[PDB]
Write a protein that binds this ligand. Structure first.
Ligand SMILES: Cc1cc2nc3c(=O)[nH]c(=O)nc-3n(C[C@H](O)[C@H](O)[C@H](O)COP(=O)(O)O)c2cc1C
Ligand SMILES: CC(C)=CCC1=C(O)C(=O)c2ccccc2C1=O
Ligand SMILES: O=C(O)c1cc(=O)[nH]c(=O)[nH]1
Length: 365
């Protein structure tokens, strides 16, 4: 389409030439929040509907955590055509995150490196922001546009499990699903919570807190994992998720690896790498986690999605839903309708009745 070409070829590269990435992010959130974007033209086909995690998703393309960290732009993100929105990560207390600069573009790689370090307005501010639109969200969710909330932990926390428990208590009642984010590369010791013993203790506490919420306020609980896990780590996570009845996995966060071939001048910056160089590392992690959970644990697939093909590869590997972030930063809002249009076309070409028929299809070949 003309908008896709205009944004991708002219407007976004021009604005990126003018603005440092964190300034660009802040202006993107402000513009989205104000609805200063035409309403998406693409009308969602019945082929794109997914029923998973106790909810209807009008389309399987979500905005990944970290774009709307503080729940400021939720309605603008639905207006952009996302089938679901995930906010956060949110930490219990407000915290500033790492010193600036902490976000870096790798244009030659269609990648970003970030070390934000969980900059967060904190649970109380986000709670009041979501409460201001709680019944609007109830109607959106009923109409197939669910809301996820991603929970983090404060830098100076002495008890990680209590940070996540506080998040469940405060934002669980406002969420369709919660994400226990134990895979940020930018908080010291956080990824150690993916270990078997630490994860079983942490997730038992999180599920007990969730189960204590009133039924209409009781969200699904997902664990978001790194792309950098050992085979042992992945087997341990699969075992714990099945043992405790965790509702789903988000696969994956950013990578601390630096794949051979990166060209960006900023490739050796500390932080998590996102975008195209992460794509197939994430797809293969989805594939492994689907097999280790016997296809019984819903997966939200994320990492380097910028086309219908990228989305369908993750769905065929075992994802019920996908998310994107970094593609939005390069191609702008038109990328959402592009992914959905291309995904519909490919499902038809490959003989799938809809997204649901394609979930895990590669494992049945
Ligand atoms: C600038 C930036 C900030 C992010 N912040 C968060 C976060 O707060 N919580 C989280 O779970 N993931 C966060 N992520 C990771 C994304 O949710 C996603 O897992 C990852 O970027 C891969 O998707 P992509 O290649 O489509 O960007 C962030 C990613 C980026 C690029
Ligand atoms: C061109 C404008 C105004 C916004 C696009 C954008 C980036 O360029 C960026 O680097 C970026 C980096 C991290 C998060 C979000 C973004 C983003 O939203
Ligand atoms: O630094 C952050 O806040 C952040 C970055 C990232 O890539 N992933 C995440 O979970 N948090």
């Amino acid at each position: 389409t003309g908008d896709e070409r205009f944004y991708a070829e002219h407007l976004m590269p021009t604005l990126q030439g003018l603005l440092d990435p964190e300034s660009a992010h802040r202006l993107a959130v402000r513009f989205t929040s104000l609805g200063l974007l035409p309403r998406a033209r693409f009308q969602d086909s019945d082929m794109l509907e997914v029923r998973v995690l106790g909810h209807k998703f009008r389309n399987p393309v979500g905005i990944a955590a970290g774009f709307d960290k503080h729940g400021e732009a939720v309605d603008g993100l639905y207006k952009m055509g996302f089938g679901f929105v995930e906010i956060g990560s949110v930490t219990p207390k407000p915290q500033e995150g790492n010193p600036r600069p902490r976000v870096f573009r790798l244009p030659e790689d269609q990648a970003v490196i970030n070390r934000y370090g969980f900059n967060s307005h904190g649970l109380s501010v986000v709670e009041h922001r979501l409460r201001a639109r709680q019944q609007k969200q109830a109607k959106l969710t009923e109409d197939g546009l669910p809301l996820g909330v991603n929970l983090g932990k404060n830098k100076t926390s002495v008890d990680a499990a209590e940070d996540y428990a506080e998040g469940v208590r405060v934002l669980g009642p406002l969420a369709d699903y919660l994400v226990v984010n134990v895979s940020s590369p930018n908080t010291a010791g956080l990824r150690s919570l993916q270990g078997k013993a630490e994860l079983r203790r942490l997730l038992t506490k999180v599920l007990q807190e969730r189960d204590g919420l009133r039924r209409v306020h009781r969200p699904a609980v997902l664990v978001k994992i790194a792309p950098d896990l050992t085979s042992q780590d992945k087997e341990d996570i699969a075992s714990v998720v099945k043992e405790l009845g965790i509702d789903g996995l988000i696969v994956t966060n950013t990578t601390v690896s630096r794949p051979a071939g990166l060209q960006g001048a900023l490739r050796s910056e500390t932080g998590g790498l996102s975008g195209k160089p992460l794509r197939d590392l994430s797809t293969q992690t989805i594939r492994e986690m689907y097999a280790l959970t016997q296809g019984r644990v819903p997966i939200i697939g994320v990492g380097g999605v910028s086309s219908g093909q990228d989305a369908l590869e993750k769905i065929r590997a075992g994802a019920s839903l996908v998310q994107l972030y970094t593609a939005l930063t390069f191609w702008g809002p038109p990328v959402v309708g592009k992914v959905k249009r291309e995904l519909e076309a490919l499902l038809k070409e490959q003989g799938f009745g809809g997204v649901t028929d394609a979930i895990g299809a590669d494992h049945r070949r």
